[PDB]
């Protein structure tokens with residue numbers, strides 16, 4: 001009579017925590033959603049085999065509209081698990097589901113897993129220096145979202161780094177690349193002209209974090225906008241003011257132009 | 266010829282990922298550091314028994330000063346694991362160690378795990394709204410740091426939440442409590458008088474993130490400063506203006522007073 005929110009991690013089925021695995025193994029029913037992110041190193045089949053349970057995949061509408069009708073009813077008389085890529089409560093609105101659980105008389109527990117939000121530490125940028133985060137959303141017909149541009153401006157003025165989650169259209173299997181994100185940003189720059197994101201802007205790209213060989217690249221937009229960063233998922237970062245130690249790591253590990261070491265004071 | 270930075274996760278020995286545990290098991294030598302943070306829900310012996318191989322604990326000095334003389338030499342002709350609490354490279358000093366591995370001609374890979382930085386999602390506060398992070402350090406002798414106070418001020422001013430890592434004297438296993446942090450912040454407010462932290466300030470406390478039963482509490486400083494939040498570790502968060510869903514989660518899951526729905530939203 002409980003509901004477990006269990007994260008599966010960054011890239012493959014082994015990114016789940018042992019705590020999460022052992023609990024999932026003992027649940028009666030196991031649901032999951034794969035629309036909030038992309039696990040590029042595994043398959044539903046491999047996950048099912050590891051957990052030894054059939055996984056009932058849910059759509060965004062199934063969750064946001066009918067979570068209390070599909071999952072909670074079973075949780076009232078069984079041990080139920082709801083799996084998600086990465087950490088279940090990071091860059092998702094899943095936290096709200098615990099409220100629905102309580103109002104349904106179902107106790108809930110959360111089991112964390114590696115998240116892209118903290119995994120960006122592998123870029124060498126100090127985690128504490130990351131400011132407000134944003135999501136670069138795909139334009140919808142004539143609707144053109146631009147809120148993320150203002151987030152960068154705000155952080156950059158404070159000397160903070162900006163983490164940019166990239167859009168994903170799971171049902172259409174569309175995963176925004178860092179290239180597409182950069183293209184969108186340059187266009188927003190033309191409209192607002194706030195001098196926030198240009199060809200000379202230094203950016204960092206992290207692709208397939210969690211894999212043994214993720215792509216970690218840093219450089220100016222003009223040089224990376226057409227570079228191949230490999231298969232999705234990707235995240236884009238616009239650094240703020242760099243510490244020499246961050247610059248050194250970017251140069252040594254992310255192949256950044258040695259000129260960034262010569263930080264301006 | 267390979268060095269693995271493996272995260273142990275949030276609280277106990279089961280917080281490591283399957284990937285990390287399986288890799289650690291196949292390594293010829295296993296090292297660990299417990300100075301950037303601790304693993305309050307377990308012991309060295311329990312971690313060692315789970316992995317099944319002896320673990321050599323390294324001091325801060327061993328790592329910061331002699332990493333290349335203690336760890337790297339073995340990594341040259343052996344597979345070596347270096348375990349760290351949480352997610353590797355979230356702690357600011359970890360990253361530079363990969364550069365040392367590069368110069369020694371040793372390949373290094375990062376195996377991620379949950380970090381408190383991302384685990385705070387369990388407070389119901391949207392991850393994108395967290396601004397710059399800060400650490401509350403104990404004043405000592407002629408040194409009385411107050412930077413964390415300004416971090417809250419600048420974040421709150423922009424409607425962002427502030428995650429406050431609390432001081433930890435790792436070697437002595439002594440943790441700063443959320444209560445002590447609140448007391449210190451009130452003292453800083455008395456000095457700076459910026460109207461940033463007072464008895465009417467809404468705060469959130471997260472203790473023992475990672476365990477199935479962490480303490481998640483929200484309320485005004487006046488009421489929480491003397492409350493018992495249980496055993497370490499404690500994390501303090503000063504939320505910025507709240508989205509109604511964040512407030513409802515705090516009320517329903519963290520026992521926050523109904524007052525926050527009309528004062529902090």
Ligand SMILES: Nc1ncnc2c1ncn2[C@@H]1O[C@H](CSCC[C@H](N)C(=O)O)[C@@H](O)[C@H]1O
Nearest residue numbers: 037086087090091115116166208209233234
């Ligand atoms: N392994 C990975 N590598 C690079 N980016 C990733 C990633 N996993 C997630 N992302 C990024 O984050 C977006 C999903 S947002 C959901 C994040 C998830 N709850 C977590 O905890 O990580 C993706 O569109 C992508 O931009």
